[PDB]
Amino acid sequence: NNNMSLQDAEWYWGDISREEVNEKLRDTADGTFLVRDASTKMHGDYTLTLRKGGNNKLIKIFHRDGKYGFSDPLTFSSVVELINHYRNESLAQYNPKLDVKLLYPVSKYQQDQVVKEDNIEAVGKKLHEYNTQFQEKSREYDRLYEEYTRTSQEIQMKRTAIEAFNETIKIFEEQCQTQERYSKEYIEKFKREGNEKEIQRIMHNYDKLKSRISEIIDSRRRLEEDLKKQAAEYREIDKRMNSIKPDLIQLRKTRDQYLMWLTQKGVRQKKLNEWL
């Protein structure tokens, strides 16, 4: 009584590429599964995709002489009989190192019911509304990203320019040290015999040095202010994108889901892209 048609089974997903199975089995608990036609397209193979150990194990179903099974002794009369048997029997019987059961089938209806308003007239308007939002979101997202990446460059250039200011300040400071040690007392002070060279020459030089070091020190501080303000703005742009991105993901799924189940399956049209 429990052996129904495979076509009407809620986990047999029909013809889907290996790629399409992957997004549906993404980050799912061990035991998630679904069935589909073999990639070869020779009907009568029905590869089984079983999620175990974070991996998508990919098992094959054989159909020799109108029977089914995993190994050579095919002892099942149909896939639904085979799938149902292992929905309560652990696969360890088939393989000791595959201790799982088919627990969480990826029902085709369970997710398909998410879409509503099957009427094509409503879908045409509903789909167009989501596309305009999605396109606006992507346009807005790109605007921030370029600014975010561009602002990253200005930060890096600013940060390095600070280091160049560190070296220039350090270089000047060492010179002030040598000047005072050498020419402050050893030569001129010993020559303190009424000569005005110290008053004019040495003092005029030293003051000019001091005004130079301070001016460089001042420019570094003014630069640090821009970096601090830029760094904070750099973080803010990160927050805007970190919130925009998750929202933009959901629209993509919803717009696609309508197209898969309303605009293509319900009514096959070349007008599909005309709604947009």
Binding site: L58, A164, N166, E167, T178, Q179, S183, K208, I249, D256
Partner: protein, 977 residues
């Protein structure tokens, strides 16, 4: 005309005026006479014993020993100069500035890095540099000659049978130009010689017609030399002339006149080279991998929008989890602190050597029904084993990376390891369980013994063959993997089955792996095309990657290594450590062959803007530039040349993006006219082809192309004496703004396709012109002379579908007209098959351009596959042909009934043969695309994208179905346009 300040060693400051082009010597000499008029001039000394110093834009405390440099080259941060006593090795310091200028970052930076792995690489690689530098000098001056001018030969001595028929009894008519007259008078001879004669016999026979050998043959025009003893038909220049039926021109030069130019190069071991208990094997430890997540320094998320956040981790081994992922409790956004012991089920003794740890910070949105919305905020991997075979332990801090935009997944197992070099990013403190000592991965001695402890004909050899011939990306089922592993001992008889037999091994069990090691140690060597597949992200084991390189070294020819250079560079990023067998192999090659080295350098240099690999490529570039030899001066001249272009181009974008083109062109001509730029853009080798050298710039021809990005058109006179025989000009497009990595891959694939078609017997003549990306969205495009876009022809000839045919007939009218149409067909056929297999779309009358001899080629690839269908989803994939009425009219010689002309059928038949020909070699094209996954191309990020090729080639179906599948495509687009 620039005010400067000099800090004399007597604690003085002197203001001075300088000429922006003034050299250091003139300034140093000029300065001191100014110092005599200051209070403490007596303690001053002569000019000698003093050198200048300043800070560069790169913020380096650089002392300029090489005084000959001038002010503009200085790139000083501010106009201040300090004078001190020169200290240290003057020659060593001068070289370091040369290296730093080439690789774009000061060499002193690598000195600061405290990571022991970085330092060990710097001094351990040098033994590779020494061996190469000694090998080039084994037999001077001969050996040094081949390094500089390596033979540009092909890997196959035997000509294809279709081309051997272009030689009457295999006789080649080669013209030899001897220039011996003192008044530069050129003499030409004509020779008819066998195709298999070595160049010396060509020289030996050449003299007698004029009436060791003392002479060498050079390619007239482009300075490529026939040095090695190879059949004259094997050299790429000679082979090409046969194909094009042109007359090959060569000139005779004396070995002395060439050996003289080769300057002796000395490689000195740098300064850093001289500078400089209880261990438990992994298998003894008995526990489960547990990792503690302490806290995240700071995450940039909004409290209102994000409900909670958590850290998601997994033990990946080359892209596949070794066990179930784990998550941390969801803590509030405002306070990111966890302090939890994540616990994994991977027993410690079973950790594979190449095991990693991928982790991320994801934000749970929820807030609607039961639909959790997860969006990762950062990511970062770390190897669980030290580059010395040591398992990380103790506390750790990690700076995470921005999520690769376009990546919706919650982990990035393919991203590069290590912390984010930037420090203002989310830092996640970890803490690895300490096992009372240092834990080392067991050595091969113990591993082999363990395998021995834990360790019949068959009729089903067909199944092994069936699997081994499958696609690299073909579905592999659990029953097969169990089948393959169960028959591992019999897989040697099919050595190309190794890539499949490796996937069937469960890397999370040391009993399995220990046996795969004892087996890989004896695997029969495999073709280099198959071994290149063992180097992409799917195979991280050191012993597997070590085997692939041993295959590369003893089977990869210098010609093939040049073709697959882009791919081999990329698979460097998949290496977990800095010092690996692949880099030693690649560097050993780049240092014994300047042709490989030139592109080895430029490929790494173009990817220095990417901080993910900036460090490991920068270290590699330094080790190369240190031992490249006399070439470094040539590279610096190129680098300095491109920089002037980039700066000039930028001024026309951020400053002159609005005014009229005439103003732009007039402004451009002035900028080119300045001598400072004028001398930088002259007399340097062309980056696209080192064998070409660019002479004087032609200001009257260089112009701003009016394309989308407004690229730059540059004309350089060929300085060679015999430039007339070969092209007399180099025209290059400099493009700043459009990524050119896709075009390089597209053009590299076309070249590989055409090679396969030639061997098959179809003379489908592709034209894969030269494209090189030098930096970030900046690159050079070679220009094909005497060719026009289809749009130009229609506009110039103005409409009707026959306009293209009329133009082509006029350009070559007479008996040649048959030759043109055949070349148009053969070329047009090749591009229809190629633009379909790779899914290049947007092809229109502006990126299809056709020469005067009838040949047709495609330009402006950019996007490939169906990226334009990924973004704006269009459900099912695939693209139609571009065969238009115009092409059909030309193919069928203008017949009114184009569709079913007699010659059209040969066109379709040869399209079929082309399609099948590529399909049989789909393994190669799959591996080439897979190795480029980490390159960061937006169109190529996951095996999902490469799966598009598996459709167009109909790899899953059978040969008959594929062909019939293809014919459906041709017919659909044929009558559809």
């Amino acid at each position: 005309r620039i005010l400067v300040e000099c800090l004399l060693p007597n604690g003085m400051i002197v203001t001075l005026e300088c000429l922006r082009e003034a050299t250091l010597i003139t300034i140093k000499h000029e300065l001191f006479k100014e110092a005599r008029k200051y209070p403490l001039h007596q303690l001053l000394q002569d000019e000698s014993s003093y050198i200048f110093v300043s800070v560069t834009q790169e913020a380096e405390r650089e002392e300029f020993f090489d005084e000959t440099r001038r002010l503009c080259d200085l790139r000083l941060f501010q106009p201040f100069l300090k004078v001190i006593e020169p200290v240290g090795n003057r020659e060593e310091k001068i070289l370091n500035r040369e290296i730093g200028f080439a690789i774009g970052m000061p060499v002193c930076e690598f000195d600061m890095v405290k990571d022991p792995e970085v330092q060990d690489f710097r001094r351990n690689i040098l033994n590779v540099c020494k061996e190469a530098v000694d090998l080039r000098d084994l037999n001077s001056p001969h050996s040094r000659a081949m390094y500089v001018y390596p033979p540009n030969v092909e890997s196959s001595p035997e000509l294809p049978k279709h081309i051997y028929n272009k030689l009457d009894k295999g006789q080649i008519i080669v013209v030899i130009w001897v220039i011996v007259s003192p008044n530069n008078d050129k003499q030409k001879y004509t020779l008819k010689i066998n195709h298999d004669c070595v160049p010396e016999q060509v020289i030996a026979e050449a003299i007698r017609k004029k009436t060791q050998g003392k002479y060498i043959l050079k390619v007239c025009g482009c300075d490529e030399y026939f040095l090695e003893k190879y059949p004259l038909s094997q050299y790429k220049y000679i082979r090409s002339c046969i194909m094009l039926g042109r007359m090959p021109n060569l000139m005779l030069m004396a070995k002395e006149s060439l050996y003289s130019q080769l300057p002796m190069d000395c490689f000195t071991m740098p300064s850093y080279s001289r500078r400089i208990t209880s261990t438990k094997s992994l298998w003894v430890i008995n526990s489960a991998l547990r990792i503690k997540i302490l806290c995240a320094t700071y995450v940039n998320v909004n409290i209102r929008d994000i409900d909670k956040i958590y850290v998601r981790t997994g033990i990946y081994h080359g892209g596949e989890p070794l066990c179930d992922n784990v998550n941390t409790q969801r803590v509030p956004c405002s306070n990111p602190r966890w302090n939890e012991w994540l616990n994994y089920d991977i027993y410690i003794p079973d950790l594979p050597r190449a095991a990693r740890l991928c982790l991320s910070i994801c934000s749970v949105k929820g807030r609607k029904g039961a639909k959790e919305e997860h969006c990762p905020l950062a990511w970062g991997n770390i190897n669980l084993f030290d580059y010395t075979d040591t398992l990380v332990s103790g506390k750790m801090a990690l700076n995470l990376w921005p999520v690769p935009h376009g990546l919706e997944d919650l982990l990035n197992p393919i991203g590069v390891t290590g912390s984010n070099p930037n420090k203002e990013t989310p830092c996640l403190e970890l803490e690895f369980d300490w096992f009372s000592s240092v834990v080392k991965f067991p050595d091969m001695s113990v591993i082999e013994e363990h395998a021995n402890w834990s360790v019949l004909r068959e009729n089903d050899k067909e199944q092994l063959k069936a699997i081994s011939t499958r696609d690299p990306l073909s579905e592999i089922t659990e029953q097969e993997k169990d089948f393959l592993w169960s028959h591992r001992h019999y897989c040697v008889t099919i050595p190309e089955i190794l890539p499949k037999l490796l996937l069937s091994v469960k890397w999370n069990s040391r009993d399995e792996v220990a046996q795969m090691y004892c087996l890989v140690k004896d695997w029969p060597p495999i073709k280099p095309e198959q071994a290149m597949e063992l180097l992409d992200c799917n195979y991280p084991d050191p012993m597997v990657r070590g085997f692939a390189v041993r295959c590369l070294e003893k089977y990869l020819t210098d010609d093939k290594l040049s073709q697959y250079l882009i791919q081999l560079v990329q698979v460097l990023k998949y290496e977990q450590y800095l010092d690996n067998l692949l880099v030693r192999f690649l560097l050993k090659k780049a240092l014994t062959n300047q042709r490989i080295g030139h592109f080895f350098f430029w490929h790494l240099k173009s990817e220095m803007h990417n901080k993910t690999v900036s460090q490991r490529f920068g270290l590699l570039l330094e080790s190369y530039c240190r031992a490249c030899g006399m070439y470094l001066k040539h590279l610096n001249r190129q680098v300095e040349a491109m920089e002037k272009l980039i700066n000039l181009t930028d001024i026309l974008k951020q400053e002159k993006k609005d005014e009229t083109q005439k103003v732009q062109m007039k402004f451009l001509v002035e900028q080119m006219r300045r001598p400072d730029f004028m001398d930088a853009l002259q007399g340097f080798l062309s980056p696209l082809n080192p064998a070409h050298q660019l002479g004087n710039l032609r200001l009257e021809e260089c112009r701003i192309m009016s394309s989308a990005k407004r690229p730059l058109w540059l004309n350089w006179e060929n300085p060679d004496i015999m430039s007339e025989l070969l092209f007399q000009n180099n025209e290059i497009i400099f493009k700043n703004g459009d990524d050119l990595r896709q075009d390089m891959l597209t053009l590299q694939i076309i070249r590989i396709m055409e090679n396969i078609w030639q061997n098959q017997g179809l003379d489908l003549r592709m034209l894969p012109y030269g494209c090189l990306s030098i930096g970030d969205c900046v690159g050079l495009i070679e220009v094909v002379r005497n060719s026009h876009t289809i749009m130009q022809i229609q506009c110039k000839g103005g409409f009707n579908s026959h306009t293209l045919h009329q133009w082509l007939k006029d350009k070559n009218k007479g008996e040649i007209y048959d030759a043109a149409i055949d070349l148009f067909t053969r070329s047009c056929a090749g591009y229809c098959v190629a633009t379909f297999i790779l899914g290049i779309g947007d092809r229109h009358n502006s990126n299809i351009m056709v020469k005067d001899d009838g040949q047709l080629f495609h330009i402006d690839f950019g996007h490939f596959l169906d990226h334009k269908k990924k973004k704006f989803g269009y459900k099912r994939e695939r693209v139609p042909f571009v065969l238009t009425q115009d092409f059909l009219i030309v193919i069928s010689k203008g017949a009114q009934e184009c569709t079913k002309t007699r010659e059209f059928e040969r066109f379709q038949e040869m399209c079929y043969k082309a399609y099948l020909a590529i399909r049989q070699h789909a393994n190669l094209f799959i591996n080439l695309f897979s190795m480029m996954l980490g390159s960061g191309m937006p169109e190529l990020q996951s095996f999902d994208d490469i799966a598009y090729i598996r459709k167009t080639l109909a790899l899953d179906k059978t040969e008959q179905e594929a062909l019939e599948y293809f014919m459906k495509q041709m017919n659909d687009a044929r009558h559809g346009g």
